[PDB]
């Protein structure tokens, strides 16, 4: 079964709610497993207490940097970086869960949740899931973003884990 994970997000210490995500382990097992383990924190590290450092309205909300909290860091459960599994899944619309990177085969822990069809990213970024529930919470995160990416409020992942 494809894992069902959660992100509990807060803005300036005030809760925004829960984002439930389905991880397509049936298409991208290695990419899904990396994100699932970072939600539980079973490897001794992960998303708990980390932030959405770059948020651009009408585009995406970016997070995953649990090491430096500014886009310069983060690491995978396999090592520093891991290869691009495949580009089978496309950035078809809002709610798409995809890996941020620094070029080909540089996947770590940084990901993004789309707020629009980001089809110009197809073949460059690994899509590994989608929002099941809490798109209203994603839109709340989006409202705290700006054209530069700078957030108007500290967007923190207060809790995260696996539902099934």
């Amino acid at each position: 079964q494809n894992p069902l994970v959660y992100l509990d997000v807060g803005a300036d210490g005030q809760p925004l709610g829960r984002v439930v995500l389905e991880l397509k382990a049936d298409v991208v097992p290695k990419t899904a497993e990396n994100f699932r383990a970072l939600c539980t924190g079973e490897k001794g590290f992960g998303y708990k207490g980390s932030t959405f450092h770059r948020v651009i309205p009408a585009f995406m909300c970016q997070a995953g940097d649990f090491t430096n909290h500014n886009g310069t860091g983060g690491k995978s459960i396999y090592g520093s970086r891991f290869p691009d599994e495949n580009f089978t899944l496309k950035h078809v619309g809002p709610g798409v869960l995809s890996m941020a990177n620094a070029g080909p085969n540089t996947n770590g822990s940084q990901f993004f949740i789309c707020t629009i069809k980001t089809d110009w990213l197809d073949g460059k970024h690994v899509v590994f899931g989608h929002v099941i529930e809490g798109m209203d919470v994603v839109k709340k995160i989006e409202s705290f973003g700006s054209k530069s990416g700078k957030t108007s409020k500290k967007i923190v992942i207060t809790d995260c884990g696996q539902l099934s």
Binding site: M60, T72, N101, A102, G108, Q110
Partner: peptide, 11 residues
Amino acid sequence: XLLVTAXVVLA
């Protein structure tokens, strides 16, 4: 521009 990168953020 509209990218999602980790290290050298581009326009």
